[PDB]
Nucleic acid binder design. Structure first.
Lengths: 76, 51
RNA sequence: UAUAAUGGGUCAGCGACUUAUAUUCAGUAGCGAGGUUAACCGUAUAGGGGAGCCGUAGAGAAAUCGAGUCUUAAUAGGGCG
RNA sequence: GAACCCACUGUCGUUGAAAAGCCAGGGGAUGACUUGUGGAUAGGGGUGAAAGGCUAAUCAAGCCUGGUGAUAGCUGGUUCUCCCCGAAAGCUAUUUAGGUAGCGCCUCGGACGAAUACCAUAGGGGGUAGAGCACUGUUUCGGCACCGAUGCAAACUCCGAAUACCUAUGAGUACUAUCCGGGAGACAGACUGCGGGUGCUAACGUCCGUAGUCAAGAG
RNA sequence: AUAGCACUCUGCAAACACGAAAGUGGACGUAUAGGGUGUGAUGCCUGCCCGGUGCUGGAAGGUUAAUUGAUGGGGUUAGCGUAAGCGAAGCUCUUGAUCGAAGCCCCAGUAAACGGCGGCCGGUCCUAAGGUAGCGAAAUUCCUUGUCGGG
RNA sequence: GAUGCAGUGUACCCGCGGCUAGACGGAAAGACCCCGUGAACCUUUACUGCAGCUUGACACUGAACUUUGAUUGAGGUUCUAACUCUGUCCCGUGAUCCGGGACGAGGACCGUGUCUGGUGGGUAGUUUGACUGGGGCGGUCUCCUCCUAAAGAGUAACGGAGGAGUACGAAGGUGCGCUCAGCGUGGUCGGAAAUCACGCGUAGAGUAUAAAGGCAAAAGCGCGCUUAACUGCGAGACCCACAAGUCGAGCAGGUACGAAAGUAGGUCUUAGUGAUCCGGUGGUUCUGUAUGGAAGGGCCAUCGCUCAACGGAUAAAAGGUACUCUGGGGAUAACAGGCUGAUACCGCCCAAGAGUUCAUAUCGACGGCGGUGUUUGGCACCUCGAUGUCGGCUCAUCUCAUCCUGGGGCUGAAGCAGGUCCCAAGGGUAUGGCUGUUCGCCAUUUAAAGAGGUACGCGAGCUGGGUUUAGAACGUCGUGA
RNA sequence: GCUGGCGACCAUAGCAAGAGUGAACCACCUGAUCCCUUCCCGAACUCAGAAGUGAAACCUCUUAGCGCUGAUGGUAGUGUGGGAUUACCCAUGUGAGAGUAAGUCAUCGCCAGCU
RNA sequence: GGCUAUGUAGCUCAGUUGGUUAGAGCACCGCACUCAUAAUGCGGGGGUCACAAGUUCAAGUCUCGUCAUAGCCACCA
């Protein structure tokens, strides 16, 4: 007999909106377990580190700051 | 294991909350201020049996 | 499946998606914001019989309101229309 | 030890002379014996010196007629012709696994047309192949836990493609997408190439991903 | 199956069986008789265990049914009330004090009742107790065609 | 596993007597094995009923005395008139039934009706899961993390590794404030390691708990005040068969902490869970079967499941069948065939060494490469509307990896003998004791008593000792079948 | 041109060593009355100030010393079509990581004070 | 869930509704008796009466809860 054979259900994480797409307020941009990406201008952060848009506009990704973090923002 | 109890409004409206507590480390009765929607004010709620 | 998997020795005759009621959809005909009678009576497929049924208004558990209504302290927001 | 009552061995017979027999041998043969006539016990009952034996060639519950055209997610079968389109053997759940239900895939009617696809430009995230030792482990040889050379990794990463995927604009070609309704079938798959787990880098083996063919396709 | 043996039940309107009952067999019998169970002529015999389950005899302590219905709490309305509300009696819904048998729990006996007759490394532990006479590779022995003797 | 396909060989047309190697020959919708939310019968400390047996209350059921317990109860002794007699006598009557009459013996007992507790395989209806490289035994069944997973999401195996069925009124909110770990030095007990002070390189510490993704505005660590671990909502998205699940700016009310701009709808996040039905508790401007109430119901809040087989068939359920039965399957096992060749057997390569020296006359360690299709196995492609046998008998046919006989090379070959290798398939190649044996051991022979294939050749050619139906017994297992 | 504050950017920008500045600013500095503070301490936070100093610290300049950046060419991998099956070859498109040559002691904006 | 009963040293049995003002028998250790032993006799140690609270001049001894255990009974989401 074996002692293995367990696994958990999938969680479906990942980027939902890519750069250059238009969004409306409330749209979810990234699903992530930890803060792989950080919230920029017009982007909010949920209690499970989800990133969502707080304005209408166009999504942009970049690398900024002294620690070299990855940021996502919405341009109006 | 934590037991379930009710926090009943002292305003007489009958409104209540439910929560749990550890009876070993909190033998006394719970007393805490909370919002009562029937009168729309913050008042004191006090512990009672879940029943 | 040529299969060494099943069935048939051959011929002739018989042998299997029906009937009643209800309901929904599609054609077609009549009438048309209306349509239609059931049992029954009837020198009887006619003619009478309008009780009843479907449509014409929704919301709400309900009382209640009604082009609105429910939720709520709220004329805000939202759900069904 | 004859009659009579049994049935231990063997040959024959096995579409037999016979739905249990013939032949040659065998046992009991005044007894718990054999037999005629007429009676009694009836089906979850009878009877049994007991084998689940017998109860009309039928017995782990007789036969006949009714309930009755019992039920069967199982097996079989399903009858004239021509034209158009054309699948699946997947996911989820199930006292579920060869059944069924919703979704995916087919067909018909209505609405609506360029909202669709192929390709070219432009924008975007990645942690695989490869590689490496900066972390986690592991390895060899020198020097004094550290230093110098040297290897390895599905559950190591200082790095990191090709493809694939999402969005916007555009030429050309194409009956394309989408929505609302009627009817389904199907939920046993197989081999080959590529990327893999398992097995022995075995199997016309087994379990996934991806493409082609068969299934349902002749030359 | 059997003669023989043993246990147990049955005092007669017997126990037991058939039957719905009336009744019938047992038996026109009467414990030297009748029913059930096991063993199986005869010779020698038949060890230990009553902890389990069963049977037999006790106890009047715990628990417990129907029945009984003590108290307590609601509904209703005469009346009292400016009011809110209060509120007898009578009907009515509910609650359940007290009384209450056998059974079980408890205590003894019983194995020719059903059953049991050890484990571990001289001891140890645990049992209700750890196999007496007799026999033993057997209708029972895996290893196994055990070993020795005879043929 | 081919009369019928491909290549090729052979073969004029048709009977009769024989024979049984094949037509997976005929016969019986396989009885072994598995499946169906099939059947029957049997068992029991499976579930749930009932008959039977038994207990008490009330009724049939009455009269007198008495004793004893907490006004009632229990007890005892007498009596006759209900009731009993499968006791005697008389009559109906020519009658061992029955009825009436007279006695005698019992007697408010026994017995019967209704209600009620106990017992109850005697009898009846039923239940007794699925996955699964056949089934059983073992393991597993829901949730979370990593890999397999092929750089979006998703992705299976009885694939490789680990966790969960909680905790916390602060370990929640807010304002203000602070940096770990390690090492080297010095310094009472005090050391490898307690506490103190100072320097050096460094996130290697910590985050209630497993792992992963994270963590400087620290998401890590302290102090003061506190209850936003609120009520009504909610534009818009993620995920998705459904049922469910997840994120959320912003608006209104009340609030906490800040001077303030502001932050707060529990905790760094992802596990810590259970639909509907039936009921309980607190409220309520709903309903209220003539009317007014009330009972009951509705709405809002909340409580009771290891329903863990975790989308949960009932409130309530274990076994046997060799006495068996029906519907199906080569969707799935045992025999033989097939694919494969781990194992098995045979051959070769290298050669430490052994052989008085001498690797190779003969053996040959440590390692490597093949062949065959005999063994033990793996798979499940053919056959379950049947391919029906472990040995013996009879009769065979082929291979060569040769047992004898024939021809050779080398030798640690004096001769006789032997060892090893090469060529060779023409012929030949034991009888008995024991056991069902194949095999094996033993006795005695022979020039020799070879190794294999042929459905482990041959049962429509024979047998039937073994195995594997129905009877019976022993040991062992089970309460029992 | 020097000084201070706030940003853009986040190593070609950093670290390490060496040197320099007191007019102003900045820093060290004096005191603990009053505001305020230490789970003890005027060390830190805070107030009242000007006797001292540029020592420390901060800023500025020099250095390739560590670090960082980094070509060209080749190699590995790879989409499509074909040929093969230890997993490579051909046509076509694409193209790392490591290493080498080489480079680096940053570059800009707004406001205020001084020479 | 309802009703009862227990939990006293090293071991086991008492003390059971007030003034409990916890004992008895065996286990030990020491002493005495004996030529040496035992039995017996003496002495000492060995619990703080399941706990938590309540009335009280007196609480193991009574009342309340919480533990564990034993026995009977009841359980249709």
């Amino acid at each position: 007999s074996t002692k293995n054979g367990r696994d958990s259900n999938p969680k479906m994480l990942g980027v939902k909106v890519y750069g250059g797409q238009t969004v409306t307020a409330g749209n979810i941009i990234v699903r992530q377990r930890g803060t792989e990406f950080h919230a920029g201008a017009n982007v909010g952060m949920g209690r499970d580190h989800t990133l969502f848009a707080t304005a209408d506009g166009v999504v942009k990704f970049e690398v900024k700051g002294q620690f070299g973090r990855r940021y996502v923002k919405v341009e109006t | 294991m934590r037991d379930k109890i009710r926090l009943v409004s002292s305003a007489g409206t009958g409104y209540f909350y439910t929560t749990t507590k550890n009876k070993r480390t909190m033998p006394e009765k719970m007393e805490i201020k909370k919002f009562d929607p029937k009168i729309r004010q913050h008042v004191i709620f006090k512990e009672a049996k879940i029943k």
